[PDB]
């Protein structure tokens, strides 16, 4: 006995969207259906209970229904602001438990392209005397989430020593990355200048450091 | 104001035992409630663990954690407590405290127990073999190239999760962007983070990030010069 939940939904900006949860005779046929909403980095918050119920701060916006071994969420009139993971919830009786579904993420189509803001930092002095080299290269407001980090040392592609971060959702619904460029001191004194290159939706932007 | 705090170690290794305790403030622990444990691994859904009532000690938990938990409550410290046994790596995850309220359903009931109203911040716990390691901090001195500054710590080589960072002590926060860390070969996370702010002010402001790494017990207040 499980609750089964889409793990992806989508609608349009002010359009509606159905989020469906499937269950058994033993938890959705015979209790209270619970809905959750998360969003990024927070903990859940209580969207439903008792099947189609709101709390206070839930607009009209989402409602909630069961039939039989199923139960749905929808919400209307679609925002950015909805982006979240959406869980359904349930006793089982069998199992004496709390059940939750899987959770579905619901994207909002539409949103605009966003390039990239890229922000290259050299290895600080005190790293140096390490007698190692870290360049830091940071990106974030990008949309849609999804990059390409090349790394250059005197504009040739550099392959050693590179390590790059998923996409991480920002709260305003862009994307966020970064990318290090693990080096010795003496690797990062041998060439002129480094490069990181960021590359999003067919454009590039592209950062130089030297050592002075 | 009923607020719920986790704390406890974020680093256990496998096959021993996890413990957590919730801190229960603006409330009794002796109220009639579910006090509850849910978790949630890194990218993934929640699990219910299972609850302590406020007013019985009565317990319930979930059968596929197979007689591992215990959950406890301690009314000389107004707090709730979990401990997992025989852990692996299916227990990594961040751990909530949670408590329901009471709403009147049609027929006049207070259905509890799915109730999850007022949450704890949550903690995260590694399960993990590897030791911990604490960061060394580096500063990081720097549309726009110039009339802002980007400013930050380079928050390296540490281990496990969480490191989080603000800077001078919480009074800066407009234009703070600490980033997701990065998990190098060595197997030791790296963070940066970073505030952008007016390029005049680099020399009539100094700019500290205040690193905490709990896991090592280790606090780091950097200042951060051109």
């Known amino acids: 006995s499980v609750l089964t939940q889409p793990p992806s939904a989508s609608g349009a900006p002010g359009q509606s969207v159905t989020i469906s949860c499937s269950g058994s005779?033993?938890?959705?046929?015979?209790?209270?259906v619970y809905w959750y909403q998360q969003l990024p980095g927070t903990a859940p918050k209580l969207l439903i209970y008792?099947?189609?119920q709101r709390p206070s701060g839930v607009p009209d916006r989402f409602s909630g229904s069961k039939s039989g071994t199923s139960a749905s969420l929808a919400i209307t009139g679609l925002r950015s602001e909805d982006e979240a993971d959406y869980y359904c919830?349930?006793?089982?009786?069998?199992?004496?438990?709390?059940?939750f579904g899987g959770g579905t993420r619901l994207t909002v189509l539409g949103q605009p392209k966003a390039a990239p803001s890229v922000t290259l930092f050299p290895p600080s002095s005190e790293e140096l005397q390490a007698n190692k080299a870290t360049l830091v290269c940071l990106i974030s407001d990008f949309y849609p989430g999804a990059v390409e980090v090349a790394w250059k040392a005197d504009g040739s592609a550099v392959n050693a020593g590179v390590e790059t971060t998923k996409p991480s959702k920002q709260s305003n619904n862009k994307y966020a990355a970064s990318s290090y460029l693990s080096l010795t001191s003496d690797q990062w004194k041998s060439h002129k200048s480094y490069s990181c290159q960021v590359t999003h939706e067919g454009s590039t932007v592209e950062k130089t450091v030297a050592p002075a | 104001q009923v607020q719920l705090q986790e704390s406890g170690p974020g680093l256990v290794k496998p096959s021993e035992t996890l413990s957590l305790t919730c801190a229960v403030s603006?409330?009794?622990?002796?109220?009639?409630?579910?006090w509850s444990w849910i978790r949630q691994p890194p990218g993934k859904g929640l699990e219910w663990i299972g609850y302590?009532?406020?007013?019985?000690?009565?317990?319930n938990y979930n059968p596929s954690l197979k007689n591992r938990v215990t959950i406890s409550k301690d009314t000389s410290k107004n707090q709730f407590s979990l401990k997992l046994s025989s852990v692996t790596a299916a227990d990594t995850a961040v751990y909530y405290c949670?408590?329901?309220?009471?709403?009147?359903?049609?027929?006049?009931?207070?259905?509890?127990?799915?109730?999850?109203?007022?949450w704890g911040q949550g903690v995260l716990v590694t399960v993990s073999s590897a030791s911990t390691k604490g960061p060394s901090v580096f500063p990081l001195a720097p549309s726009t190239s110039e009339s802002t500054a980007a400013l930050g710590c380079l928050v390296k080589d540490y281990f496990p999760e969480p490191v989080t960072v603000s800077w001078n002590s919480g009074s800066l926060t407009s234009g703070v962007h600490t980033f997701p860390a990065v998990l190098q070969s060595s197997g030791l996370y790296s963070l940066s983070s970073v505030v952008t702010v007016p390029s005049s002010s680099l020399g009539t402001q100094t700019y500290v990030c205040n690193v905490n790494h709990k896991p090592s017990n280790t606090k780091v207040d950097k200042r951060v010069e051109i």
């Open positions: 603006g409330g009794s622990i002796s109220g009639g409630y579910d």
């Open positions: 008792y099947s189609n």
């Open positions: 302590i009532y406020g007013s019985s000690g009565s317990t």
């Open positions: 005779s033993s938890n959705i046929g015979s209790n209270y």
């Open positions: 949670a408590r329901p309220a009471y709403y009147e359903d049609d027929y006049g009931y207070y259905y509890t127990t799915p109730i999850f109203d007022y």
């Open positions: 919830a349930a006793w089982d009786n069998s199992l004496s438990s709390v059940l």
